[PDB]
Design a protein around this ligand. Structure first.
Ligand SMILES: Fc1ccc(Cc2c[nH]c3ncc(-c4cnn(C5CCNCC5)c4)cc23)cc1
Length: 277
């Protein structure tokens, strides 16, 4: 710990949680191991109010070199706050900890897939507008997500969607042992990601929401996807999906990235479609 550069130690203090401020229960995991070593935690604020949080131990980090990068990951992600983006409550420096807020309803794809829950067409579009909002915030900060899908969005107690799976919340699904179908055609052809490829992915997420979490292109192999899209074939209009919203999904999948809507135009368009219910 004393090996760390003191200027960097100083720069990361506003992201660091003191040990006396956090209670981690290592005896109870969140989400039956499906998110790796994520535990129920209790974070205390300056007023001593208790915040129920999700604590992830970062086992991969073992040396002062990898520790330094992680401090910078915490510093950058701490400045990303928006109601539709999953926040970084803090970091704890026993492997380093990543303290995230608790999401009662877990991931979005699993929530919409669970037969017990019956969201309406309005609730679904409302989840899509929420994602679009978080994505609009990320695009304003020049942040490229690179892996947007319903499995990577979380749901809290007030059914507020949070864009996750980025920064210190990356590798969300690393269950240790004893995404071409969301990718833009140019991402598949050149391995380069932009806001314009995030929009293609958002279009897929919109289709996932309206099908209640059906897998895209079930009969197309991941190697065959490139040829399929080059022929100008796309995901079909889901059953209870309105024509204006399907027109939006198709605009998201245009072969020319520059012809695709921005997240601002998608927020604008989707909110006005949402308002018609
Ligand atoms: F580095 C990362 C570390 C952790 C994450 C995930 C994560 C963060 N906060 C969370 N809060 C709650 C849940 C969660 C999972 N399952 N559940 C319910 C579902 C409904 N049934 C009961 C169980 C709630 C997951 C998370 C991402 C990145």
């Amino acid at each position: 710990l004393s090996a760390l550069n003191p200027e960097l130690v100083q720069a990361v203090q506003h992201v660091v949680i003191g040990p006396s401020s956090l209670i981690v229960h290592f005896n109870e995991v969140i989400g039956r191991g499906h998110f790796g070593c994520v535990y129920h935690g209790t974070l205390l604020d300056n007023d001593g109010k208790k915040i129920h949080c999700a604590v992830k131990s970062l086992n991969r980090i073992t040396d002062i070199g990898e520790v330094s990068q992680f401090l910078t990951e915490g510093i950058i992600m701490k400045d990303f706050s928006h109601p539709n983006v999953l926040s970084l409550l803090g970091i704890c420096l026993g492997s380093p900890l990543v303290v995230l807020p608790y999401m009662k309803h877990g991931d979005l794809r699993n929530f919409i897939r669970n037969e017990t829950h019956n969201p309406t067409v309005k609730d679904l579009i409302g989840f899509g507008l929420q994602v679009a909002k978080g994505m609009k915030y990320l695009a304003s900060k020049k942040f490229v997500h690179r892996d947007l899908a319903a499995r990577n969005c979380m749901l809290d107690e007030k059914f507020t969607v949070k864009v996750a799976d980025f920064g210190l919340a990356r590798d969300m699904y690393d269950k240790e042992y004893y995404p071409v179908k969301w990718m833009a055609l140019e991402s598949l052809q050149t391995q380069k990601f932009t806001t314009k490829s995030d929009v293609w992915s958002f279009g897929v997420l919109l289709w996932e929401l309206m099908t209640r979490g059906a897998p895209p292109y079930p009969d197309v192999n991941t190697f065959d996807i490139t040829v399929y899209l080059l022929q100008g074939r796309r995901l079909l209009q889901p059953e209870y999906c309105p024509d204006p919203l399907y027109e939006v999904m198709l605009k998201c999948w245009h072969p020319k990235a520059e012809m695709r809507p921005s997240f601002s135009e998608l927020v604008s368009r989707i909110s006005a479609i949402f308002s018609t219910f």
